[PDB]
């Protein structure tokens, strides 16, 4: 078992689901 980084850095808000969020907003029209 290898401990890889859990997040894409520390400079922008975390969640990786951002693709679904922006697209959903288009459909509707801690560091």
């Amino acid at each position: 078992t290898v401990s890889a980084p859990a997040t894409y850095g520390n400079f922008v808000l975390s969640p990786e689901n951002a693709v679904t969020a922006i697209s959903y907003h288009s459909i509707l029209a801690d560091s």
Binding site: F11, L13, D30, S31
Partner: protein, 49 residues
């Protein structure tokens, strides 16, 4: 009107009505807003400097 002293003055209407027509004119200018800056302003995120 001026009170007369030599001739007999004719009676007149002391008020007259005039009609004026109006002119119309529109003025317009466009301006544009980037979406990215609008999202910055809308979404209120403040975590980092």
């Amino acid at each position: 009107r001026v009170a007369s002293g030599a001739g007999l003055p004719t009676s007149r209407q002391t008020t007259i009505m005039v009609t004026k027509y109006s002119e119309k004119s529109p003025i317009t200018i466009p301006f544009e807003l980037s979406a990215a800056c609008l999202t910055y302003l809308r979404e209120t995120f403040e975590g980092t400097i």
